[PDB]
Structure formats: structure tokens, C-alpha cells
């Protein structure tokens, strides 16, 4: 109930890279991304198995999660809900995969060669959440998908949403278009800020007596990460509905 010792210091960074640059530029952010992708692929393969409509088995857990996501999308829309269901699933639980290993033990010290030398002992964990490049890329992909879906709905209608919003009187067009363009960047900043701020809070609790304060803040951060994953998925479907609208 004291934790008098153990509080060595505090250190942080924006993004962390790793070795392997020789063949192509390889960063620890891409390493964590590949690790999360491997874990998700393993989960999908295990959940596949027999899949003979067998209840429970922990494959039915993922089935219930996917069914809840599908029901949420169906309540959201129906024009391309099933069409974008795998597209939404791309975001779904991938951001949670970033939240996964967010509270990993020693993830911050992962890459300590180790405060002695520190010359190349950069923390080589660098969660995909702690990578705005991943966040900006996902947001750009979502914006491109939304724009393509809207153009497929009505490309002339997509143009008339902003350029021909209101030729007579006043048109929220262009200004709204700018808001939509920021919305990809806004969503990217939301995810980029998310987890990254949590990691800072984890370090800060570690900076000052990590005695179960990191436990409650970490639990709040994990809930916030799940919420942020659901939020990015919902924002994608919301932009899709707005384009459909």
C-alpha cells in the first residue's frame, strides 16, 4: 500500500522505429501491426475450425460479436450494410487489437536492450495505435471507400452534395465538403490521440507510484479503447449513411 521504491524515472516518445530498415524501412510500429495481424489471423483460423453451427466453443462468442455488429449496421443502414460489413469488420477488433497489448506487461520496457546505456535501447513495442501513420492510413481508406460508395450511388449526386448544394439562396456545400474532408482527419486524430494518451497515462502512473492507480486508469483506458474501436466503426457507417442520405 506504499510502493515507496521502484519509481525510477519517466520517459516518453512520439513514435518508435526498429531495425530491419535494410531491405525496406521497417519500424517497431509496423512490427506491432504485424503482431496484431498475426494474432487476429490466428483467432480467425481457430474460430473457423469446424464451424458446424455448434453453439459456444468460443467461436460462437466471435459469432455473437459479429452478429451484434451486423445488427448495429442493419439498424444504421441497409443499402450497403452487408456490402460494407466486412469493410466495417476490418476496423472492428483491429483497433481493439491495438487496445489489446496496450496494457501489456512490460510493453513500455519492451525494447530496453535497461537505463544504463540506452544508446540503441529504444522501446521497440510501438503499438499500431501508437502510429498515426496507421491511423491516417485507415482513415484515408475509410474516406476513399465512403467517396467511392457515394459516387456509385450518385457521382453527380456526390458533386451536387457540395458544388451544387444550393445554387439558389445559400449552400452549406463546400463548407460541408470541408467538414467531411476534416472528418477523415478528425477520425484519424481521434484514434491517433486515443491509446497514445492512454500510454502516456500509464507511464505517468508508473512515473508516480504505480500502485493500482495504473490498474484503474488502465481499465478505463481499455474500456476507452473498445469504445474508440466501436466509435471508428460507427463513424465509418455514419459517413456511409450520410453519403447514402
Amino acid at each position: 500500500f506504499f510502493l515507496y521504491t521502484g519509481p525510477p524515472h519517466v520517459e516518453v516518445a512520439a513514435e518508435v522505429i526498429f531495425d530491419g530498415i535494410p531491405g525496406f524501412p521497417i519500424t517497431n510500429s509496423f512490427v506491432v501491426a504485424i503482431i496484431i495481424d498475426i494474432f487476429v489471423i490466428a483467432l480467425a483460423v481457430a474460430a473457423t475450425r469446424n464451424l458446424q453451427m455448434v453453439p459456444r466453443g468460443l467461436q460462437n462468442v466471435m459469432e455473437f460479436i459479429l452478429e451484434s455488429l451486423y445488427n448495429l449496421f442493419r439498424n444504421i443502414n441497409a443499402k450497403y450494410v452487408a456490402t460494407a460489413f466486412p469493410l466495417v469488420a476490418t476496423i472492428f477488433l483491429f483497433v481493439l487489437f491495438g487496445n489489446w497489448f496496450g496494457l501489456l506487461p512490460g510493453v513500455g520496457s519492451i525494447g530496453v536492450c535497461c537505463a544504463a546505456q540506452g544508446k540503441k535501447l529504444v522501446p521497440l513495442f510501438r503499438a499500431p495505435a501508437a502510429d498515426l501513420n496507421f491511423t491516417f492510413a485507415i482513415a484515408v481508406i475509410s474516406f476513399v471507400f465512403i467517396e467511392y460508395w457515394g459516387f456509385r450511388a450518385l457521382g453527380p449526386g456526390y458533386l451536387k452534395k457540395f458544388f451544387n448544394t444550393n445554387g439558389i439562396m445559400s449552400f452549406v456545400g463546400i463548407i460541408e465538403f470541408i467538414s467531411e474532408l476534416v472528418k477523415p482527419f478528425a477520425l484519424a486524430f481521434r484514434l491517433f490521440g486515443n491509446i497514445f494518451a492512454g500510454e502516456v497515462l500509464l507511464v505517468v502512473m508508473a512515473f508516480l507510484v504505480p500502485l493500482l492507480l495504473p490498474l484503474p486508469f488502465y481499465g478505463f483506458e481499455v474500456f476507452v479503447g473498445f469504445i474508440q474501436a466501436l466509435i471508428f466503426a460507427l463513424l465509418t457507417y455514419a459517413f456511409l449513411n450520410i453519403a447514402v442520405t
Binding site: 525496406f24 524501412p25 519500424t27 510500429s29 509496423f30 501491426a33 504485424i34 495481424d37 487476429v40 489471423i41 480467425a44 483460423v45 474460430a47 473457423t48 464451424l51 453451427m53 466471435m62 459469432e63 459479429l66 452478429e67 451486423y70 452487408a82 460489413f85 466486412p86 469493410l87 469488420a89 476490418t90 483491429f94 499500431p128 502510429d131 501513420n133 496507421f134 491516417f136 492510413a137 485507415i138 484515408v140 481508406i141
Partner: protein, 152 residues
């Protein structure tokens, strides 16, 4: 940076497509199969209830058809029997008429037996008049002729 961003984007897109085609398409197929099985089960339950009702109605209709055919056959037999009975009654009436004609023919035996007046009746009346009412004195010439005239 930007190259790393593009590489992360490519990796994410590839993993997304792979995971989709691996699980989500199978997951969508399984969920759609379950929903279709439920809908087909509801439709088949309705069809089974309809089949049971139709079976009861068909049993009733077959019983009704059997009853109608039986009634038609019975009515035809009854009509034939009524015609035969009418023919029998007509034959009985004809036989009764023949019997009445035979009785009328036998009634001629009354006139046939009436040809016994001079044989029996004349002598009987003469004897009665001579003996019973009148005394033995019977002086009656032509009274026998009068009796013969009355006999005709």
C-alpha cells in the same frame, strides 16, 4: 514515414481482405443459413398445420363422397324395387279382376239351376197346394198352366 504509412495501409488492406474472405464470408454464410433455416422451419410448420387440416378435410370429403354414392345406389335400388312392387300390385289387381270375371261366369249357374222349375218346383208347388193349404180336393185345370206361366 509516408512510405511506412503506405506499407501499413497495404498490410492492413491485405489482412482485411484475407480475414474477410476467410471468416466473415463463412460467418455470413453460416448466419444466413441459420436465419433461412428458422424461416423455412416456420414456413414448414405452417405447411404441416395446413396439411393436417387438409387431411382432416379430405377424410371428411371422402366420407361424404362415399355417403353420396351409397345414397345414390340405395335410391336407385329403392326405385327399382318400387317399380317391381307396383308391377306385382298391378298383376295382383289383374288376377283379382280375372277372379271376379270367373265369379260372374259362375253366376250363370243361377240361371242354369233355374232350369229345374218344371223338374222340381212345379211338382213341389202343386203338391204343397194340394196337400198343405187346401184339402185333398184339388180341382185345378190350368192352375198348373198358371204356375208354369209364373215360372217363366
Amino acid at each position: 514515414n509516408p512510405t511506412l504509412f503506405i506499407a501499413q495501409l497495404i498490410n492492413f488492406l491485405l489482412l482485411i481482405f484475407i480475414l474477410r474472405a476467410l471468416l466473415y464470408r463463412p460467418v455470413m454464410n453460416l448466419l444466413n443459413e441459420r436465419t433461412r433455416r428458422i424461416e423455412e422451419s416456420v414456413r414448414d410448420a405452417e405447411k404441416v398445420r395446413e396439411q393436417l387440416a387438409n387431411a382432416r378435410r379430405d377424410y371428411e370429403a371422402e366420407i361424404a363422397r362415399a355417403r353420396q354414392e351409397a345414397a345414390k345406389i340405395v335410391a336407385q335400388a329403392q326405385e327399382r324395387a318400387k317399380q317391381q312392387e307396383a308391377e306385382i300390385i298391378a298383376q295382383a289387381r289383374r288376377e283379382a279382376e280375372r277372379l271376379k270375371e270367373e265369379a260372374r261366369a259362375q253366376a250363370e249357374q243361377e240361371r242354369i239351376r233355374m232350369l229345374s222349375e218344371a223338374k222340381s218346383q212345379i211338382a213341389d208347388l202343386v203338391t204343397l197346394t194340394a196337400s198343405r193349404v187346401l184339402g185333398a180336393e184339388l180341382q185345378a185345370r190350368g192352375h198348373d198352366a198358371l204356375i208354369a206361366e209364373s215360372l217363366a
